[PDB]
Amino acid sequence: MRECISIHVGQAGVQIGNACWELYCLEHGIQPDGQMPSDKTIGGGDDSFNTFFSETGAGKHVPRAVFVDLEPTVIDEVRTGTYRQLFHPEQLITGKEDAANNYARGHYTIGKEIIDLVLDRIRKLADQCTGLQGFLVFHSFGGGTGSGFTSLLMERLSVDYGKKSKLEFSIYPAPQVSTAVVEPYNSILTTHTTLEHSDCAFMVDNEAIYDICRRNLDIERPTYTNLNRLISQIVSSITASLRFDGALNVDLTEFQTNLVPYPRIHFPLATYAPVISAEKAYHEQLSVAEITNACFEPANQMVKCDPRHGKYMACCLLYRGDVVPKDVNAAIATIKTKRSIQFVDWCPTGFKVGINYQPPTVVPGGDLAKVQRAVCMLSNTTAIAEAWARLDHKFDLMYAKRAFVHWYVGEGMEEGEFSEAREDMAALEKDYEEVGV
């Protein structure tokens, strides 16, 4: 067994971590006080769930997680929340004043104050690992802390843990729920500084999660609680192979090997189905073919884009529930004839399938209904570059007038790092278009 440490940065990272670890405990049968009655190896073990949880002599199962926010009010709700007993106080780190939606304030000014304390608390969890394989980083592109401090942390993690893989769960900025106007700045700045330090990054456009909650959950004004519970389901599907018995994506290296042929192009698109409202009185349960066909509808993707006008480099299908290989190939046979699925010429056209028999778990009283079977598709399609084009266009509009730049320069940043970061993004869009045409 090889352990994975999760790191949650900023408001979006911390609150999504709350959602995921709440879901993990329900799936593994762990209680808010850390007890796991099904675990018969008291005080230790090397099962698959021990990748994400350590064990104390009293039987407590402690997440291998560290929460860090430059401002305390979000983590304070964790310190007093329903899972207050789950975490040790040392893995919850807070400052006094936040980055104020300023990448340069989170990376340079306030980040330098706390970067050494975080790495020490991170070192405390790594010393409990018999064989660390890497980290899972949760953060937002738009936040000053989620963008600024994460990039500083990702730089240092490549130094102190040069042999470890690092995966990102990033919240792409959407104005419907965003509270900052300078989020395109923070997004480009943090993507440039983090690009060579992340092995695989799963982007989640809040616009896509918002409309999914409106369309498929009948929620008029979705809140972060609504969004984060749906996001945790996707994240749980992606990490389920690290926590459960299986042969597909068993370590973080296999995520890069299966999904990322080019180091820079490491942004797989995630599609998830079915999303069913718990208030739906009468529901006809969807079949394997129906939910596999839904993986190629843009309305079910974490980033709204058109994969028909790009090219795939890899494709995973992660099933949960009553699914057998026979029904999957029958579904893939039908879908290949009716949809535009073009792979790059240097890649085989095919799918890697992983099936977990335990159906998806839902929190009691949540918005999601229990389903018999579900699927998360991880596809590395060049169509996701549409999100970079949108983001870079908003960057180009503001930066042409140098609007809000003084806030970043006033923190010690240099105006050149803007154009330097934008140049790297212009190269990233260029790489996608080469592979995709």
């Binding site: 500083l152 299986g246 999957v328 799918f351 028999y357 006033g410 923190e411 010690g412 940043m413």
Partner: protein
């Protein structure tokens, strides 16, 4: 459709389906730029305190 590498267990099973074959900066440099930006902050604050002194 070729179904390969089928592994099974109690939790579930996995396999692969093929439809067609093919056709870092050091800690020194990090501390250096973190301090170069603090120097640019200290300089801008000094020019402010010098301006307020006049």
């Amino acid at each position: 459709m070729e179904v390969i590498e089928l592994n099974k267990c109690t939790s579930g099973q996995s396999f692969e389906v093929i439809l067609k074959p093919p056709s870092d900066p050091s800690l020194e440099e990090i501390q250096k730029k973190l301090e170069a930006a603090e120097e640019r902050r200290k300089y801008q604050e000094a020019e402010l305190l010098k301006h307020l002194a006049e």
